[PDB]
């Protein structure tokens, strides 16, 4: 208890750089120790948010957490649920909603209202349909969408009940003004209904929640906010700012991260040639006036903006990406193809009869590294625009989750949604070969829909689990309650973090990843 409290103590002092906390190793008793110390810590200090991450739903200590809060609490104890928030899944939330509706668990404030009644009837019908779908052994995507719609209906019912009750109306429900009024109203008059609201929907007012116990899968697969419909991602939420995230079973937060990253990389594809030229036009848009200025300044400052642009303009003439490529197998990176430039055709060929091979194999990495640098620059500008927008719009910790910032930057620059997604995925990167530049596999294609050009489809992987841990280390600081490609790369971490590291096609991609990992080692 006191040992774990002292271990967690220095993290706040070391939060000047958001340090590592190593790996306190030991053989269920170890888990029960951290919950008591965390409860005492959160009770003692008012401004501190924990992010206890478990790995199994049963492993979550929802009963153990609650049987330790009052023990560490003084006479002026908090409302438990007002501070402790266990993030649950849509399925179990629906189950709990139905259970509360049936046997009057929910207070009469949301029972006397008829809209809540009809929403719960619709929810029950949708849950019966969901059970039938689950019995069908089918793709749970359609049924999940239907259930999410049904739950959004009752969620919106809660807002429309609370808005007219409080001193507000207008039914985003004033995401800067009336949201605060709703949260204030539900903090002073309610006695037991507030308890049910906090226990059932912890995300209603997340910023005031102290301890966030949740499984790793939900920790990496985003969460659905109460008022908003679209699910915000955990890794980018201002909630995670200056947080302390305990990683119980931290050894298991490697396979999940790697598996999610490989699916994310495979799912989002784009053409390298079109994506590069589109970015350069948007970059050239900045220099040449245009843009809303609010974003324009930051860009004109910080000189490197002009060097990335002259680099782009320089290599565009060298590789003629202004001219559309032409075709007449994967290409991994850490019988070959060439490319001339037949003026007659006014394009470049890439059929093998080596005429003027500029070593296209070196064309690929130059474009890749330019895209990496430009994306880091755009990420920095998006961070600046984020902090500015959030600072002028003082609010209740809810705005510009820095996925919106970069996507807005890319949409202003004249780029498609998929291109913006690829650019942000490349950008979010702010030593061995894999951990330095990673894998970048390219694949040519042809289609009768577009025969005069060949789409150089690019699959990019640069976010290894160690870099994910490093980014989580920039947003917040981790703990080490844990006890070849499933044990991270602790040596690389001790290299990078340094002073703060210690004290006390899916299959194909997988294979590729493992390989160079090994080579690097």
């Amino acid at each position: 208890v006191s040992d774990f409290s002292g271990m967690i103590k220095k993290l706040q002092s070391q939060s000047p750089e958001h340090a590592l906390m190593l790996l306190n190793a030991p053989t269920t008793g170890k888990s029960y120790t951290i919950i008591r110390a965390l409860c005492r810590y959160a009770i003692k200090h008012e401004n501190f948010r924990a992010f206890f991450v478990t790995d199994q739903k049963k492993n979550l200590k929802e009963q153990d957490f609650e049987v330790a809060w009052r023990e560490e609490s003084g006479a002026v104890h908090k409302a438990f649920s007002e501070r402790v928030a266990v993030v649950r899944s849509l399925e179990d939330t629906v189950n709990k909603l139905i259970n509360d509706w049936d046997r009057q668990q929910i207070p009469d404030l949301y029972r006397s209202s008829p809209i809540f009644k009809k929403s719960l009837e619709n929810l029950g019908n949708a849950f019966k349909s969901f059970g039938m779908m689950k019995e069908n052994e089918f793709d749970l995507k359609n049924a999940w969408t239907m259930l999410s719609r049904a739950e959004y209906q009752v969620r919106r019912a809660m807002i429309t009940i609370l808005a007219d009750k409080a001193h507000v109306k207008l039914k985003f429900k004033l995401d800067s003004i009336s949201k605060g009024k709703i949260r204030e109203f539900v903090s002073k008059q309610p006695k037991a209904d507030s308890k049910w609201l906090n226990e059932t929907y912890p995300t209603f007012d997340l910023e005031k929640k102290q301890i966030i116990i949740l499984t790793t899968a939900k920790f990496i697969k985003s969460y659905t906010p109460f008022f908003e419909k679209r699910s915000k991602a955990f890794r980018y939420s201002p909630i995670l700012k200056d947080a302390l995230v305990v990683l119980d079973e931290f050894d298991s937060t490697k396979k999940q991260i790697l598996e999610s990253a490989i699916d994310e990389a495979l799912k989002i594809q784009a053409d390298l040639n079109s994506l590069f030229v589109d970015l350069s036009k948007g970059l050239n848009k900045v220099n040449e006036g245009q843009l809303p200025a609010k974003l324009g300044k930051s860009f004109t400052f910080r000189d490197a903006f002009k060097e990335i642009l002259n680099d782009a303009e320089q290599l565009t003439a060298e590789f003629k990406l202004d001219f559309l490529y032409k075709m007449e197998g994967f290409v991994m990176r850490v019988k070959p193809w060439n490319a001339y430039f037949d003026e007659e055709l006014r394009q470049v060929v890439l059929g093998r009869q080596p005429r003027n091979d500029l070593n296209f194999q070196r064309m690929l990495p130059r474009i890749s590294v330019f895209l990496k640098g430009a994306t880091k620059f755009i990420l920095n500008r998006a961070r600046e625009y984020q902090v500015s927008e959030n600072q002028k719009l003082s609010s209740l910790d809810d705005a510009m989750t820095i996925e919106d910032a970069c996507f807005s930057i890319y949409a202003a620059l004249g780029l498609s949604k998929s291109q913006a997604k690829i650019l942000f995925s490349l950008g979010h990167d702010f030593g061995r070969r894999f951990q330095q530049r990673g894998l970048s596999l390219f694949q040519f294609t042809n289609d009768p829909q577009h025969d005069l050009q060949t789409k150089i489809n690019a699959c990019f992987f640069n976010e290894t689990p160690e870099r994910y841990l490093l980014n989580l280390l920039s947003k917040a600081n981790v703990l080490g309650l844990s006890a070849v490609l499933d044990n991270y790369d602790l040596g690389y971490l001790r290299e990078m973090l340094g002073p703060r590291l210690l004290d006390g096609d899916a299959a194909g991609l997988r294979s590729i990843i493992e390989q160079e990992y090994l080579f690097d080692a």
Binding site: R111, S112, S113, P114, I115, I161, D164
Partner: protein, 102 residues
């Protein structure tokens, strides 16, 4: 009693009723809130002890579940008039009162 047997509809007859008071409300005198709380308002007709007819306006609000301690009213749509509810019945229940601003 004879008034209580009446109905709002044109060309009606004596229909038996158990409600002590005659409360007449149609579909025109009806509005909904943001909670979809159906709120009719009727026209109470009563002859007092000095044989004067009173036409006071009575407002009814919607309640989901039966209240065994309060009076429960149910709208008889066919006869166009409110009726007392002594036992739980299918339909939507109503209770006297108007707590909205307007």
């Amino acid at each position: 009693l004879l008034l209580n047997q009446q109905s709002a509809n044109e060309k009606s007859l004596l229909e038996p009723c158990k409600t002590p008071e005659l409360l007449i409300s149609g579909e025109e005198w009806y509005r909904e809130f943001r909670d979809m709380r159906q709120q009719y308002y009727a026209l109470k007709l009563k002859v007092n002890w000095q044989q004067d007819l009173e036409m006071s306006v009575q407002t009814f609000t919607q309640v989901t579940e039966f209240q065994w301690d309060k009076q429960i009213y149910q709208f008889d749509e066919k006869r166009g008039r409110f009726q007392l509810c002594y036992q739980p019945s299918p339909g939507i229940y109503f209770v006297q009162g108007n707590h909205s601003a307007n």
